[PDB]
Design a protein around this nucleic acid. Sequence first.
RNA 1: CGCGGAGCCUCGGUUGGCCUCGGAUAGCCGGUCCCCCGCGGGGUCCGGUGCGGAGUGCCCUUCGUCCUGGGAAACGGGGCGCGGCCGGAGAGGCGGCCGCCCCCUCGCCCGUCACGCACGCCGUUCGUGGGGAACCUGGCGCUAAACCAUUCGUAGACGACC
RNA 2: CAAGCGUUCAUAGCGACGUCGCUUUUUGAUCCUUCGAUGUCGGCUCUUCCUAUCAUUGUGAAGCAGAAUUCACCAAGCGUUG
RNA 3: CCGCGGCGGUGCGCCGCGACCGGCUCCGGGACGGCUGGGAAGGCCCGGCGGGGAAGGUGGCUCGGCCGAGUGUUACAGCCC
Lengths: 201, 138, 109, 175, 190
Amino acid sequence: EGQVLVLDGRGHLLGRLAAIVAKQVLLGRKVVVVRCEGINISGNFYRNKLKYLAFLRKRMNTNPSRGPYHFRAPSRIFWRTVRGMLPHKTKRGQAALDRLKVFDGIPPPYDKKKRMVVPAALKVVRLKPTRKFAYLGRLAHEVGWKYQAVTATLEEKRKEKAKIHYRKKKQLMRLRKQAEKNVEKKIDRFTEVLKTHGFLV
Amino acid sequence: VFRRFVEVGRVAYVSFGPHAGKLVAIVDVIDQNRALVDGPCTQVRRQAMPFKCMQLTDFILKFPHSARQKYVRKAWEKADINAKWAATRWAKKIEAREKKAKMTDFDRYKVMKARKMRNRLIKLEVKKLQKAALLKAS
Amino acid sequence: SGRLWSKAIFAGYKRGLRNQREHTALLKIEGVYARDETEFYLGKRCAYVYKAKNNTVTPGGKPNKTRVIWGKVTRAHGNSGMVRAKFRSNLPAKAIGHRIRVMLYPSRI
Amino acid sequence: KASGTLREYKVVGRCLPTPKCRTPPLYRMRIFAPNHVVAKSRFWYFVSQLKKMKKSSGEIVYCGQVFEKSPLRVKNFGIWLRYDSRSGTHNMYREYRDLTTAGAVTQCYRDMGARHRARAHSIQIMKVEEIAASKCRRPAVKQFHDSKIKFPLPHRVLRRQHKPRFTTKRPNTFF
Amino acid sequence: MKTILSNQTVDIPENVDITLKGRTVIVKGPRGTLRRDFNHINVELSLLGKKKKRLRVDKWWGNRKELATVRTICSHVQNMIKGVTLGFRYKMRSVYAHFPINVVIQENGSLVEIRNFLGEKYIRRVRMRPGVACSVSQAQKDELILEGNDIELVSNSAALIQQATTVKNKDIRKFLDGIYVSEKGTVQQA
RNA sequence: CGCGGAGCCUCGGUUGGCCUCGGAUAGCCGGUCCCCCGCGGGGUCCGGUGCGGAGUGCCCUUCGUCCUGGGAAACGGGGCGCGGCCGGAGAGGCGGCCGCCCCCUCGCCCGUCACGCACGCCGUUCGUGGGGAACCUGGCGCUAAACCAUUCGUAGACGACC
RNA sequence: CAAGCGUUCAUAGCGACGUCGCUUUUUGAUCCUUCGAUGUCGGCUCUUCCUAUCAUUGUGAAGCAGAAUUCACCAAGCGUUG
RNA sequence: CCGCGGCGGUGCGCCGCGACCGGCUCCGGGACGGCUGGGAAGGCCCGGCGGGGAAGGUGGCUCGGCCGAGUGUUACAGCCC
Ligand SMILES: [Mg+2]
Ligand SMILES: [Mg+2]
Ligand SMILES: [Mg+2]
Ligand SMILES: [Mg+2]
Ligand SMILES: [Mg+2]
């Protein structure tokens, strides 16, 4: 498709998603992954913690401030995984990463946009229901976030707000349906021509 | 809790594969992914057919569990699936997809128009309902 | 007054892994994800279109700033509804992950 | 041997006649393979173990499909088997509940792959035989086996996870 | 091998009224109300008996290791029913050679306060969980009574004080002192 | 800030979509007669949808111009039309909602005529008052600090800093 | 694996005759790199890593009563001197 | 000079079209042979001969409004195999 993408990270699989993101970043499409705390990983909680802590020990001995940067926020963690699936030594790879953009929680502009979901990276689909897991949120915490608590309380504040809109939008649809029935004999030979070639049945 | 109990005789619509978009009586279950399947009046031979390529309907019928064509010819024929299907909500939103793909550029120009004025005659009433909802609030 | 030029991205030029072959480009047309799907896009003209700095002539027009390498879709490219297209000049790599504009006007309906 | 989906390339063959013995015996094996050219080759592997018989000293008389007498009717295929494990070489009763002898072993060859990492070139079929209702031992099979037999297809994933490669709607899996 | 079906009916008494929100069972009888979620185990919980007579847990396309769990859900439900009808009572009798283990409950249940286990100056404190009413008994000498509706909660809490009271760097063959569970039962027996 | 006239250059694009939460061996919506809470929220009952039709397989809006002279539709839209009160802060940047002036009468059917009919041909159409860099009009505001030199040392190689 | 010791008792602790491995802090083989020559032994100082845990934290063992002691686990956090 | 008549060479620069042919890569159709003179199936029936699951059955038990639903057993056919 065209235009800016917004993907809602919750319920996705950390790398399975990131491969799909990274393909479309390289095709010039602007992606914005949101809510990366929610993003989740196969294998049990600890497994991947233990696997992260393995990362943290990897560190340039003779000076570490050069050595690998083990970013702690889920946004950043995922970025990393996307980035490893780009050719980021090269100009198109860095130009690619710039087309990506990644947040923890869901911010201004992106609260206020409908937003999509990659079923082929989606956990309920890709995984078996009898298998264990981490949320990159909790993983990120036990590795050195400072901001699981904050991005909780803000998202609760956003959810409460978004619910108002959902309910007002719910109330307009109830008006649409009641107003179809309150005018169904001066649109009763247009609605006809809709339902004849499929539209609206 | 489920409501569709893959019996001897759940009518199943074949989602896809060689016989896509046809109804099929599950005669009998072979295995944990394969049935012995047959769609007499929908034109589908008694053959094996997997549960992955078929979705299933609220309808049942009552041949017994290795009945032989003539007997599933009936039980389909009365009970009458091919009329009861077509009064369903499946059949009418299938046979709508159908009719969009099957739509000439002319048809589409008409709809463009027919919609527009529908969507105005619907809108002016919604505006008027909020006027009455605001005067009710007063 | 709209598309005509139907939307497509230029993905890479046809390549092995430690080689690449710059005649044939690989064209990712929008709304076409199968090799069954794509038999329309065969034969169609396409255009990587730009502007660049100096003015250049324009048939049915005054000299504009726009230029085009001007090509043609040869055949499909693997299961997923990618397409191979070879333009008259080779494509300039700058274009990787940009538009090209696959038309209708050598239609075969 | 490899596979595809197997077929009953049944075969008979004599040990070609010498001056001393002019009418040597003939023998149908239910060689049981993917085409002719191997199912030919596979009796002679097999006969050369049993008889003192060989590709030089023989002839195939008849090779041809035996093709199912009851392929719309579900059936309880047993199979006095023999294989070669990494350790030794081992006999098996096994049951597949397909509706067609060949497809029934087509299963078996795919399970011996999976349940034992046994490749076809190691396996030997002693003999398949369809079995009645009773005289089935394997509870796996011994359940499909009833009249009022009953399923739902509980946690049905979507495939077509790339038609809409993305969407707004999250999927569903209760149906 | 996957087993086509396994199931089990729990026989619910006339006192109690279970009402399952999808998978989440809530149980209310005389004593109180309990709740628990089986939003893991993945089974089909039907309430088939009209008036209200049966919980039936299904399991359905299940291999061996989930077939196990049919019966475990079936249990935490009986175990709830017994809890909200009768209610449980774990008794735990303190044990010693010498220094008298000196218990004193300190809000209602909640704080179980233990001076002098083995002459130790540090006064062990132990919280109970919510809904667990500890109390020092009578009709017996060195003996606590942990009352509650929830088995889970009542027996961590036994175990918390049973484990808070452990000796170190000794023979625990010899040093058989501490507080430990003597009798798992109920408040009302019927 | 507004609204004016030329011109280097750097490019990508070529309707929008203005929104719940999450479940997945379940959900969606309606309506409450009834009950509790703060027009709403929670509850209970019933009625609908649930290979989903207040379906991202989705919805919307239109796309050669105006004439004039019928029907269907009729107060819709506009003048960078103009003031006030909102609501929105996670890295807001946007909505929203009220007076008054002038102007216009547009969606769908139809008649009825018209618009350089360029004489089969290409970068056609817009987001475009793009981004940025140079210069011609009015009104209102503006009206330095930094570094050196000096001094001090709280600091010192010089540099740095108080 | 296991015949034994361990009052008794295989296996608390041990453990023969056998047998399967690692490891490269021992020496050998080897001669692949260097002979337009890479400074050839020790000591001092100074970092860092490993665990093949001597201490200490938390633990499971004992033929652990205490005291004292060895067997083992996570464990390399800080110790290892004149 | 006007013919751009007929012949021979080209194209200033950007282009587009057509029909033969070679090689390819595809896509629609339609007809036949064989075979255990193919297995299988269908329909029509008919007249027979047998066996198993299992009944428009019967029966023990359950759940619901005699009927409907569940389980349990002998097995004839008023189902089917
Ligand atoms: Mg342009
Ligand atoms: Mg001691
Ligand atoms: Mg001895
Ligand atoms: Mg040197
Ligand atoms: Mg160790």
